Amino acid sequence: GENLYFQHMRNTGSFNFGIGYGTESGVSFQAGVQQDNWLGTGYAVGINGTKNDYQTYAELSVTNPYFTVDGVSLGGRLFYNDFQADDADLSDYTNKSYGTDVTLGFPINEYNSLRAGLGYVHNSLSNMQPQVAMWRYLYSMGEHPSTSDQDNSFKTDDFTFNYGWTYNKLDRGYFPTDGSRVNLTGKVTIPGSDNEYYKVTLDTATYVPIDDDHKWVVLGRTRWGYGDGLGGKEMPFYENFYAGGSSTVRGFQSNTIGPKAVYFPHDLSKSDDAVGGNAMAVASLEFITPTPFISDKYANSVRTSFFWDMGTVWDTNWDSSQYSGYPDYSDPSNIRMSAGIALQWMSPLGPLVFSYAQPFKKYDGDKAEQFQFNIGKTWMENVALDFS
């Protein structure tokens, strides 16, 4: 019983810094500060922020992993986000949001967890160059912007119900060899929201070893997105799915896959600026092989692989009749593919990932990116903040 003294009195504080560079994100920073038993409450409370070329994010984060003796966890967040779409290689807009989330998590068993939460978000959109897909969302909301005026304000307040499921039975954290990870993440809007939509994503990764020593391994990944409106409204474009880049279809510039903007005039205009869509599918097959010639002293510090990536995005609400003389961006069948090589290295300066891929199937508008690279590292310094 008396160990409840020392537990309720112990409190650690952690600063964390992070630096990183990627072809997706640009130069990247993380900073964060937290205490894990704040005021002897059991809650871990923290403040942390991130910055990319396209996104700046900040939050207060409250989270108690033993909200019940059984392992049910209660987690919370207050956040500000600024997203600058054109530094994400999409057609331009600015999305400044803030809001809040609270999330019950349940450990079903040692490989499965579930999540239920409620979320509120406010979104502020501005700087929207007028274009067809975007404006069709706007009109579905009752807004009628001018199509010659290169602005807006459009603001929405949404409340959501959010669920998820994660199955994880990978044998190892960094260089997996065996087993699968599944993740599902859904949401739906609840009455009182301005937007009215659902959105659901499924991720799967499955590792299959050929030899007993687990040095040759097939890995198949899939990624699946679908959302839509409920009352005649569309899912808001700011929640679109994207594809292309280091983490989805190598050999493609980030987000370049799928619909492209069709701009009104200041006599409509075709473009190569991606806008994403409300539906998406990605898949990859990867052959993991021992790495030549390094010798098995550095063995599991490095990993090499040959891949076939593929994927597609589409606009289920694109009206191809009305835009007869534009590409049919409702066609799911325009599947992109690439083939390449990949090198991973738990380097002294942290995780490192080198892709070289050729996109052998690519459609009008799609932007190549063969060479893709990702590095980053995190320092964590601790301090005791105890109540003895």
* CATH number of domain containing 212: 2.40.160.50
Per the CB < 8 A criterion, the answer to whether 369 and 261 are in contact is: no
Distances (CA, A) of 188 to 226, 230, 277, 290, 295: 12, 9, 17, 44, 52
Is the C-alpha dihedral spanning 140, 190, 97, 237 positive or negative? Answer: negative
Cα(375)–Cα(26) distance, integer angstroms: 10
Q: Give the DSSP letter of residue 133.
A: H
Which residues lie below 8 Å from residue 255, measured CB to CB, with a gap of 6+? 88, 89, 90, 242, 243, 244, 245, 274, 276
Please name the method used to determine this structure: X-ray
E-assigned strand segments in the chain: 12-22, 26-35, 44-51, 55-64, 73-84, 94-109, 112-126, 153-168, 179-189, 197-209, 217-229, 251-252, 279-289, 302-314, 336-347, 350-361, 368-369, 371-384
Per the CB < 8 A criterion, the answer to whether 36 and 30 are in contact is: no
- For residue 33, give both structure tokens: 């500060």
Per the CB < 8 A criterion, the answer to whether 306 and 286 are in contact is: yes
In degrees, to the nearest 5, what angle opens at C-alpha 282 toward C-alphas 278 and 285?
A: 175
Residue 368 forms beta bridges with which residues?
Answer: 252
Which residues lie below 8 Å from residue 377, measured CB to CB, with a gap of 6+? 18, 19, 20, 349, 350, 351
Distances (CA, A) of 132 to 125, 264, 276, 282, 329: 16, 7, 13, 25, 11
Domain range enclosing 83: 1-388
Residue closest to 303 by CA, chosen among 221, 217, 178, 372: 217
Cα(302)–Cα(351) distance, integer angstroms: 10
Residue 222 forms beta bridges with which residues?
Answer: 204, 283
- For residue 259, give both structure tokens: 């619909």
Tally of domains within the chain: 1
Cα(86)–Cα(289) distance, integer angstroms: 38
Q: Give the DSSP letter of residue 216.
A: S
In degrees, to the nearest 5, what angle opens at C-alpha 166 toward C-alphas 229 and 203?
A: 60
